[PDB]
Design a protein around this ligand. Sequence first.
Ligand SMILES: *[C@@H]1O[C@H](CO[C@@H]2O[C@@H](C)[C@@H](O)[C@@H](O)[C@@H]2O)[C@@H](O[C@@H]2O[C@H](CO)[C@@H](O[C@@H]3O[C@H](CO[C@H]4O[C@H](CO)[C@@H](O)[C@H](O)[C@@H]4O)[C@@H](O)[C@H](O)[C@@H]3O)[C@H](O)[C@H]2NC(C)=O)[C@H](O)[C@H]1NC(C)=O
Ligand SMILES: *[C@@H]1O[C@H](CO)[C@@H](O[C@@H]2O[C@H](CO)[C@@H](O[C@@H]3O[C@H](CO)[C@@H](O)[C@H](O)[C@@H]3O)[C@H](O)[C@H]2NC(C)=O)[C@H](O)[C@H]1NC(C)=O
Ligand SMILES: *[C@@H]1O[C@H](CO)[C@@H](O[C@@H]2O[C@H](CO)[C@@H](O[C@@H]3O[C@H](CO)[C@@H](O)[C@H](O)[C@@H]3O)[C@H](O)[C@H]2NC(C)=O)[C@H](O)[C@H]1NC(C)=O
Ligand SMILES: *[C@@H]1O[C@H](CO)[C@@H](O[C@@H]2O[C@H](CO)[C@@H](O[C@@H]3O[C@H](CO)[C@@H](O)[C@H](O)[C@@H]3O)[C@H](O)[C@H]2NC(C)=O)[C@H](O)[C@H]1NC(C)=O
Ligand SMILES: *[C@@H]1O[C@H](CO)[C@@H](O[C@@H]2O[C@H](CO)[C@@H](O[C@@H]3O[C@H](CO)[C@@H](O)[C@H](O)[C@@H]3O)[C@H](O)[C@H]2NC(C)=O)[C@H](O)[C@H]1NC(C)=O
Ligand SMILES: *[C@@H]1O[C@H](CO)[C@@H](O[C@@H]2O[C@H](CO)[C@@H](O[C@@H]3O[C@H](CO)[C@@H](O)[C@H](O)[C@@H]3O)[C@H](O)[C@H]2NC(C)=O)[C@H](O)[C@H]1NC(C)=O
Ligand SMILES: *[C@@H]1O[C@H](CO)[C@@H](O[C@@H]2O[C@H](CO)[C@@H](O[C@@H]3O[C@H](CO)[C@@H](O)[C@H](O)[C@@H]3O)[C@H](O)[C@H]2NC(C)=O)[C@H](O)[C@H]1NC(C)=O
Ligand SMILES: *[C@@H]1O[C@H](CO)[C@@H](O[C@@H]2O[C@H](CO)[C@@H](O[C@@H]3O[C@H](CO)[C@@H](O)[C@H](O)[C@@H]3O)[C@H](O)[C@H]2NC(C)=O)[C@H](O)[C@H]1NC(C)=O
Ligand SMILES: *[C@@H]1O[C@H](CO)[C@@H](O[C@@H]2O[C@H](CO)[C@@H](O[C@@H]3O[C@H](CO)[C@@H](O)[C@H](O)[C@@H]3O)[C@H](O)[C@H]2NC(C)=O)[C@H](O)[C@H]1NC(C)=O
Ligand SMILES: *[C@@H]1O[C@H](CO)[C@@H](O[C@@H]2O[C@H](CO)[C@@H](O[C@@H]3O[C@H](CO)[C@@H](O)[C@H](O)[C@@H]3O)[C@H](O)[C@H]2NC(C)=O)[C@H](O)[C@H]1NC(C)=O
Ligand SMILES: *[C@@H]1O[C@H](CO)[C@@H](O[C@@H]2O[C@H](CO)[C@@H](O)[C@H](O)[C@H]2NC(C)=O)[C@H](O)[C@H]1NC(C)=O
Ligand SMILES: *[C@@H]1O[C@H](CO)[C@@H](O)[C@H](O)[C@H]1NC(C)=O
Ligand SMILES: *[C@@H]1O[C@H](CO)[C@@H](O)[C@H](O)[C@H]1NC(C)=O
Ligand SMILES: *[C@@H]1O[C@H](CO)[C@@H](O)[C@H](O)[C@H]1NC(C)=O
Ligand SMILES: *[C@@H]1O[C@H](CO)[C@@H](O)[C@H](O)[C@H]1NC(C)=O
Ligand SMILES: *[C@@H]1O[C@H](CO)[C@@H](O)[C@H](O)[C@H]1NC(C)=O
Ligand SMILES: *[C@@H]1O[C@H](CO)[C@@H](O)[C@H](O)[C@H]1NC(C)=O
Ligand SMILES: *[C@@H]1O[C@H](CO)[C@@H](O)[C@H](O)[C@H]1NC(C)=O
Lengths: 491, 491, 493
Amino acid sequence: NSTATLCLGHHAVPNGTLVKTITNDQIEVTNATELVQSSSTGRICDSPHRILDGKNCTLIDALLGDPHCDGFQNEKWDLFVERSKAFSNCYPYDVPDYASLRSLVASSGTLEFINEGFNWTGVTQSGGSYACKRGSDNSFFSRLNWLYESESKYPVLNVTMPNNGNFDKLYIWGVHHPSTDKEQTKLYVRASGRVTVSTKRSQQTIIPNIGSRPWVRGLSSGISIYWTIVKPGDILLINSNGNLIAPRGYFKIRTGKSSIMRSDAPIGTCSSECITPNGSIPNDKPFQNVNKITYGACPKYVKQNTLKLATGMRNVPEKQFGAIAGFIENGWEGMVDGWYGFRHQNSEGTGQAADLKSTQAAIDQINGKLNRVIEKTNEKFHQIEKEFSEVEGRIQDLEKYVEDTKIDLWSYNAELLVALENQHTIDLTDSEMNKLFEKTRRQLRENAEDMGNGCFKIYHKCDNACIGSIRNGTYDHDVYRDEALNNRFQI
Amino acid sequence: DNSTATLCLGHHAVPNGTLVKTITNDQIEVTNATELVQSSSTGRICDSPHRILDGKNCTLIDALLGDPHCDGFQNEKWDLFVERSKAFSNCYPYDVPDYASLRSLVASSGTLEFINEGFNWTGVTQSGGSYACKRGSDNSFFSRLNWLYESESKYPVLNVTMPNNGNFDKLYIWGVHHPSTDKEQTKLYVRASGRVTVSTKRSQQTIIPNIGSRPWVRGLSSGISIYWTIVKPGDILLINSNGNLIAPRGYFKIRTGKSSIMRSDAPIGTCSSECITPNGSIPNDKPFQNVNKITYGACPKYVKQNTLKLATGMRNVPEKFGAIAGFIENGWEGMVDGWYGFRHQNSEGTGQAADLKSTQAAIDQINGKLNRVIEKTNEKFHQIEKEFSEVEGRIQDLEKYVEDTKIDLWSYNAELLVALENQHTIDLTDSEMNKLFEKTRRQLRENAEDMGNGCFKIYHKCDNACIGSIRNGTYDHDVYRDEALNNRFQI
Amino acid sequence: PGNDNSTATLCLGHHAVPNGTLVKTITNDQIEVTNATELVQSSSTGRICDSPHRILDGKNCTLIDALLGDPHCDGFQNEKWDLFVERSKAFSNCYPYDVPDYASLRSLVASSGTLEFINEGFNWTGVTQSGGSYACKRGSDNSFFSRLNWLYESESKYPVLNVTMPNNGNFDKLYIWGVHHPSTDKEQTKLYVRASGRVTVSTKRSQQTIIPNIGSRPWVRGLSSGISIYWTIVKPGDILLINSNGNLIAPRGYFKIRTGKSSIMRSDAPIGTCSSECITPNGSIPNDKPFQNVNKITYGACPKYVKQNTLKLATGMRNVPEFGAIAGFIENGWEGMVDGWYGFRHQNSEGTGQAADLKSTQAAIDQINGKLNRVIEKTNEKFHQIEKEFSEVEGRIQDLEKYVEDTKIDLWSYNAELLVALENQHTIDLTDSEMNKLFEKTRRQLRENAEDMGNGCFKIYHKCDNACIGSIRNGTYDHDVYRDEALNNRFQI
Ligand SMILES: *[C@@H]1O[C@H](CO[C@@H]2O[C@@H](C)[C@@H](O)[C@@H](O)[C@@H]2O)[C@@H](O[C@@H]2O[C@H](CO)[C@@H](O[C@@H]3O[C@H](CO[C@H]4O[C@H](CO)[C@@H](O)[C@H](O)[C@@H]4O)[C@@H](O)[C@H](O)[C@@H]3O)[C@H](O)[C@H]2NC(C)=O)[C@H](O)[C@H]1NC(C)=O
Ligand SMILES: *[C@@H]1O[C@H](CO)[C@@H](O[C@@H]2O[C@H](CO)[C@@H](O[C@@H]3O[C@H](CO)[C@@H](O)[C@H](O)[C@@H]3O)[C@H](O)[C@H]2NC(C)=O)[C@H](O)[C@H]1NC(C)=O
Ligand SMILES: *[C@@H]1O[C@H](CO)[C@@H](O[C@@H]2O[C@H](CO)[C@@H](O[C@@H]3O[C@H](CO)[C@@H](O)[C@H](O)[C@@H]3O)[C@H](O)[C@H]2NC(C)=O)[C@H](O)[C@H]1NC(C)=O
Ligand SMILES: *[C@@H]1O[C@H](CO)[C@@H](O[C@@H]2O[C@H](CO)[C@@H](O[C@@H]3O[C@H](CO)[C@@H](O)[C@H](O)[C@@H]3O)[C@H](O)[C@H]2NC(C)=O)[C@H](O)[C@H]1NC(C)=O
Ligand SMILES: *[C@@H]1O[C@H](CO)[C@@H](O[C@@H]2O[C@H](CO)[C@@H](O[C@@H]3O[C@H](CO)[C@@H](O)[C@H](O)[C@@H]3O)[C@H](O)[C@H]2NC(C)=O)[C@H](O)[C@H]1NC(C)=O
Ligand SMILES: *[C@@H]1O[C@H](CO)[C@@H](O[C@@H]2O[C@H](CO)[C@@H](O[C@@H]3O[C@H](CO)[C@@H](O)[C@H](O)[C@@H]3O)[C@H](O)[C@H]2NC(C)=O)[C@H](O)[C@H]1NC(C)=O
Ligand SMILES: *[C@@H]1O[C@H](CO)[C@@H](O[C@@H]2O[C@H](CO)[C@@H](O[C@@H]3O[C@H](CO)[C@@H](O)[C@H](O)[C@@H]3O)[C@H](O)[C@H]2NC(C)=O)[C@H](O)[C@H]1NC(C)=O
Ligand SMILES: *[C@@H]1O[C@H](CO)[C@@H](O[C@@H]2O[C@H](CO)[C@@H](O[C@@H]3O[C@H](CO)[C@@H](O)[C@H](O)[C@@H]3O)[C@H](O)[C@H]2NC(C)=O)[C@H](O)[C@H]1NC(C)=O
Ligand SMILES: *[C@@H]1O[C@H](CO)[C@@H](O[C@@H]2O[C@H](CO)[C@@H](O[C@@H]3O[C@H](CO)[C@@H](O)[C@H](O)[C@@H]3O)[C@H](O)[C@H]2NC(C)=O)[C@H](O)[C@H]1NC(C)=O
Ligand SMILES: *[C@@H]1O[C@H](CO)[C@@H](O[C@@H]2O[C@H](CO)[C@@H](O[C@@H]3O[C@H](CO)[C@@H](O)[C@H](O)[C@@H]3O)[C@H](O)[C@H]2NC(C)=O)[C@H](O)[C@H]1NC(C)=O
Ligand SMILES: *[C@@H]1O[C@H](CO)[C@@H](O[C@@H]2O[C@H](CO)[C@@H](O)[C@H](O)[C@H]2NC(C)=O)[C@H](O)[C@H]1NC(C)=O
Ligand SMILES: *[C@@H]1O[C@H](CO)[C@@H](O)[C@H](O)[C@H]1NC(C)=O
Ligand SMILES: *[C@@H]1O[C@H](CO)[C@@H](O)[C@H](O)[C@H]1NC(C)=O
Ligand SMILES: *[C@@H]1O[C@H](CO)[C@@H](O)[C@H](O)[C@H]1NC(C)=O
Ligand SMILES: *[C@@H]1O[C@H](CO)[C@@H](O)[C@H](O)[C@H]1NC(C)=O
Ligand SMILES: *[C@@H]1O[C@H](CO)[C@@H](O)[C@H](O)[C@H]1NC(C)=O
Ligand SMILES: *[C@@H]1O[C@H](CO)[C@@H](O)[C@H](O)[C@H]1NC(C)=O
Ligand SMILES: *[C@@H]1O[C@H](CO)[C@@H](O)[C@H](O)[C@H]1NC(C)=O
């Protein structure tokens, strides 16, 4: 009745969350947030990126001029989305090194075509075929010019076209492979043509082959698509005596944030900086498990489906007349106004208060590292291809091995970051408890003794005002020193 | 005659300490440490669990084609296929454009399962053989290749199609003959120059043979260039040649699997090891390894370091008639039954005990971090090539830059990890010692004083039964308080 | 009776400075410390040091124009180098030519680091040699590439050439050869007779065959003609065969292939007289720091490229800048302390004093340098790498060469950022720990003769002259000497 008891404790919660640290695989903390994004709406947000839905068309069909893809002429995009249902309805074709041409056009992000009048005098022009119906007429690829005998002759063609602008020119052209020797001489007179497109830097010579194409959409013939880039100050030189599929001009090559993605996800009305083939995902978290193929500012792909960062101290439930005990035994599920506080027992009764300074001190540290964790947007656009449909060998072996190495290294960084941050999270919250106890230990000077359970036995009368003067940093030990030393030192 | 006792707090020491690295120190001595970089091999490739296929005198490509001394490899399968350096070609001279890619894709397929398809081939004679490819006592040829050639002194143009109506990728292996002389060209194919064209809906491959180019190999100044074509389901194979065709007899079934290939001369043995290197099989108990960067299976990660030692014990401090001394001075080499404990000196003499609770808290934290360091498995199969015999240029520069960049990043992660863990290992063990010392301090309340050297001066008769009460937390400070406050406070 | 007998005060503190430096930790984005150091090298003199690496200045010559033998590049014959520096002012003044896969030929010649050419005498009987053109003037005569031979009519005939050359010695042979693409059919028949030629260069491992095209080359320096350049490597025990009827540009021998530290770099930085292990296109940079933001293109032992332009490593304690009563480390630091990081301030009957503790000052300094030595020890010596800046639009191979380097920098930028944050959080902790250890060291040898005032100071309950204070500082303090006097003052008897 001539003493009081002051106890030091920290809060606790009835649920709790398990996290990983350097030490333990499962340790229970009060709060925790998720770092790995693993869900998506399924809708690609048409904002803030220019999304161009390919619909029934691939990038190459819209490039060449397949008539059902004529809506895509001169179109521009940030992310061009190819669908699975896309399909070819013009003349049969192949593209040697298909992936590269699809890659560089996607990076340019524009189908802006500029027409150029080549001379083509001595040949007839704009040949078509019934397999490429535009409307009801027999047409052909809109950006390709198909040359063929004039007055039953077909001379050697020497045609040039300089680049005097300050900007790169992509010329798309082709070589015909007739079904029979009849079709060869009917269109080109000579038994075998030769195609040679040249610059000051490059030269592409293609010998056409006769009847070397399988049956596609009514025809055993086809055209091989090639491309040539003409830098400023350079010149295009076409040289053919047969089977030339001429360019009607060039596509302008730009450099920008543009790329291409394969996805069947619907385009919706929303805003999201990050885009996956699964759909748009938020970029609030630092890591994501949705898909390694991403466009825009996105979390980093990791193998882990979950990585929980601890945002609170160890949870130690009380699991146990009225008596009070300190942090040594357990935490306090009854303290909701703070993380650290004082439970007292004195002459006027018993009470709880929380300590604002130490609680904010811990929170400021906890939420400072959250800001350090989330400050990395890391914005990426046109990357490498990460899923493949044909067997290719050496090059995709390296293209896979690079991406797979990238993911293992970031999965390592993520696992270690969460483990270090949490081991530091638990330690800093332990430190703020101990500092508050030692701060209270030293105010009391010689007026109290440490009971061992995180509580002080104060050897003098200590009304609610005196407890307050301990909580508040205003306890004067000299006022009570005599009364305390009397009760302490009895024989 | 004496009214006091001395209770000292200490930790253990060992005579054969081990040096490790920390964030601070380059060399600090601890009691125990374990190695993390695997650096030794038995020199044998364990045949379990993975299916090892010893290539013996055969390369994968010779076994693919059907070099008669490799006929045993027909239709064989593998998980890892081992090419010996003694392997050698004994059939018709040949070369393969993009040899690496064909070797890579066949290796990752993991099977030589062949399916005979009967092409029509009317108008030519099949199964041509040579003396430079003796199968048994007979002039023969590659077992999977059909060397077509004149019939009735006529060689008509060949139009053949074989559709892939399966649901699974087909691998056709074909070739092109390069005769030694003009006389040999016309005797075998009538025409002065041939033309081999293999076509899918997606690709075309047209080859025009050169005459006399090949150097003398095993009796012949001739040879065949091998090319490959993959026909996807629903697509169709179309062969077309007016000369020099080396035809396929069918397709190799393509599979997706854990299979790969490795260049090694290590002997195959009877044992079991998850990890395989060209040096031989290595244990994957350690997270890192310095044996070889070429690995197959669940393997440790390759690092540049040849030794990384993880501290698994506290700082080693030798203790070095003499008053008993605590941990502030030095450890205790005599302590064997624990890492922490008490030495006391009272009226019954001296004694030494160990504290289980503080020792397991240190041991369980050390085992907890080991289990997190060992938990990584890392199972990789078909990767990229990492050693090269020919000078190539752009592509292997990237293949070398990728692997060399990988090895540096993991060597950093391994070095930093050891330094972080050991600093934490030392810090956590020093913490347990401080926690046991403070736990004892507060049991003694006002009955003792901290002598400074990590020892308490207890101011009352404290027989062995009283020490044991302090040791297992049953000391009642009130029982000895009046006596102790008497002895402490004399003037 | 209040404080009747005299007492003394002994305070524990740490130094502070008026010009602190902000650094990053695991907790805080900006926390002020006393001393810091920069880890990211972000400046260069702009000069490529001619030491300790053998630098070769291309001047008006590219590596391939020196390779082929462009007459204004005759000084570069048989020259060697560690780093060869192509200049952007260079140019080709011989016969017009293109090189399919020019990047690979440039790369392997640079990696060999030598243009050591070994003349071999092929058997060109039946053809005439040393074909020259006026677009390639050497001296005042019409000439041609010094290391190429241009074969052409022999008595108005030019038959099928069968030519062989064995590789009888050790180590590889690089053969450089080409194919002429004549401007007109007249030039085709006036030089080669046959309508169309055919160049075939073969080994046991490979074929290379080329069917030349007429009039396929644009007008360059007076000629609508050109030569396509091709190369073949002949391993030991293998053999070179040249089979051609027309349009053959024959080699005069091979370049000896070596393997070593050699490479090539594109830079307009002037060469200077100085020594530096690291070379960038921007110039040479010091390799003391572990990271650099100058250029991702480097040669030699260089700091690693990172996106960050500054990463400051804390190399001192937390800076906390600082009634006649002294106070301790709990409140603030002591700007007055110059001779040490930690120390004591006291007030007693002889006055007020101050002294620095050398033991705990070194304990922090030695731990800080234990960090620096682990941080600064990373040499990282890389030589011939991959190309990292491109001028032509290529596609698939280009995307991977960019994605690999782009992924590398992001991974080291992470490692750099995390390392600075960990190293600084550990610095602040250890410097705080040494303060608390020095205070507890004093607390324990004072025994029952003082009380902790709570501000990092002790109220010592006995007369304590300067020699008394010095004993506490030297640790020679004996508490029993003062124990009776102190207990009498602490507790009233
Ligand atoms: C577009 O190309 C045509 C055709 O020439 C091509 O050009 C080169 C680059 C290669 O691609 C070749 O393979 C092609 O042949 C050019 O037509 C020629 O233009 C010139 C100059 O204008 C004409 O020369 C004139 O000829 C007059 C007499 O020609 C008449 O008589 C001759 C016989 O004497 C007869 O062969 C010809 O067919 C005519 O009937 C002459 O009085 C005048 O002074 C001048 O020399 C030449 O005749 C044209 N050829 C043809 C077949 O029409 C174009 O010039 C070119 N245009 C552009 C803008 O470049
Ligand atoms: C080389 O052989 C192939 C294989 O037969 C030839 O292709 C075939 O060409 C015929 C031409 O009529 C095709 O017939 C058509 O088939 C469609 C299928 O639905 C049918 O609807 C039509 O009424 C018509 O009968 C046949 O399908 C086609 N088959 C294949 C596999 O391509 C090819 O023509 C031959 N080469 C030459 C130069 O003739
Ligand atoms: C020094 O530290 C190492 C820590 O790696 C100690 O080695 C470890 O010792 C324990 C028990 O002695 C071994 O546990 C065993 O685990 C296997 C399963 O892996 C189980 O089958 C056994 O029954 C046993 O429980 C552990 O494997 C072993 N680890 C290593 C890497 O050696 C070592 O004992 C310490 N030295 C001293 C002197 O304490
Ligand atoms: C493999 O394909 C060959 C083609 O080289 C098949 O033989 C040819 O089959 C066609 C169609 O049945 C025959 O064409 C017809 O010939 C008669 C002969 O008078 C003619 O009157 C018809 O108007 C038509 O043109 C062709 O003669 C025939 N050639 C030969 C040499 O047999 C052959 O059937 C296929 N192999 C098989 C089915 O085993
Ligand atoms: C182009 O010239 C080359 C080189 O002279 C010719 O190849 C050579 O052909 C002869 C043919 O008898 C080879 O001789 C053989 O040597 C082996 C090994 O000593 C021996 O066992 C045989 O009995 C025979 O004597 C010679 O080795 C071979 N040399 C090379 C480098 O290939 C080639 O035939 C010529 N081609 C034309 C179209 O002129
Ligand atoms: C913790 O320390 C206390 C104090 O040393 C231990 O309590 C008492 O320890 C003594 C000696 O070990 C026990 O004496 C024994 O009692 C049995 C039963 O009467 C008797 O047959 C033996 O000859 C001996 O005298 C005593 O029983 C025990 N106290 C009680 C209530 O059992 C205690 O055992 C220590 N606990 C641990 C886990 O070490
Ligand atoms: C603030 O921190 C920096 C970096 O820790 C300190 O710079 C270091 O200063 C020492 C000299 O006290 C340098 O060591 C000396 O190096 C020279 C050769 O340069 C040698 O002749 C001496 O015998 C001595 O070893 C050290 O290199 C230097 N480090 C750096 C990165 O500059 C600086 O002194 C600190 N300032 C204060 C006021 O503490
Ligand atoms: C194929 O057509 C191209 C272009 O139509 C021809 O290139 C042209 O070749 C003539 C050669 O006399 C060049 O004339 C020269 O021009 C320079 C610069 O103006 C001048 O200084 C000379 O005195 C001479 O007149 C002309 O510039 C050049 N044009 C282009 C665009 O390159 C080429 O010759 C034709 N093919 C054949 C086999 O003739
Ligand atoms: C070393 O040399 C390289 C060039 O070889 C320098 O890169 C160039 O840096 C300048 C900026 O000083 C870039 O110009 C402008 O940069 C701003 C960003 O500050 C950007 O927003 C503008 O659009 C513009 O690009 C320039 O583009 C860049 N590249 C080239 C080829 O000039 C590099 O800065 C030099 N090293 C250091 C440390 O500065
Ligand atoms: C506390 O420790 C310090 C450091 O050891 C003591 O200061 C040093 O004290 C020694 C004597 O113990 C001085 O040595 C003397 O130097 C004079 C120079 O005039 C010489 O004539 C003497 O023969 C003797 O060698 C030393 O100079 C002095 N340090 C400095 C920088 O002067 C201090 O005395 C110790 N105090 C206590 C109370 O233990
Ligand atoms: C595993 O094999 C590799 C390569 O066969 C060994 O590395 C070679 O070591 C020799 C030492 O005499 C060097 O001369 C070679 O240059 C090394 N090759 C490479 C590619 O580095 C390696 O030492 C072997 N490992 C073990 C444990 O025996
Ligand atoms: C634990 O339960 C409380 C009950 O109010 C709840 O507010 C809290 O969100 C739960 N924990 C987490 C991590 O959500
Ligand atoms: C995203 O799509 C890929 C491929 O279609 C699929 O494997 C993966 O499970 C999907 N993930 C989510 C979260 O929908
Ligand atoms: C972030 O700081 C705010 C400021 O009070 C706080 O509400 C929140 O709980 C903090 N986040 C944590 C502690 O995870
Ligand atoms: C608490 O402290 C504040 C200043 O920090 C003071 O104004 C107030 O009076 C104090 N409360 C009591 C009860 O002393
Ligand atoms: C390999 O070839 C050599 C020489 O012909 C022979 O002695 C050896 O037995 C062969 N080994 C196998 C496994 O075929
Ligand atoms: C090689 O030289 C000899 C002698 O000069 C000559 O007889 C022979 O024809 C030459 N071989 C050729 C030109 O292939
Ligand atoms: C590291 O040691 C040097 C030389 O002894 C010293 O000058 C420097 O101050 C030390 N480091 C720091 C951060 O003080």
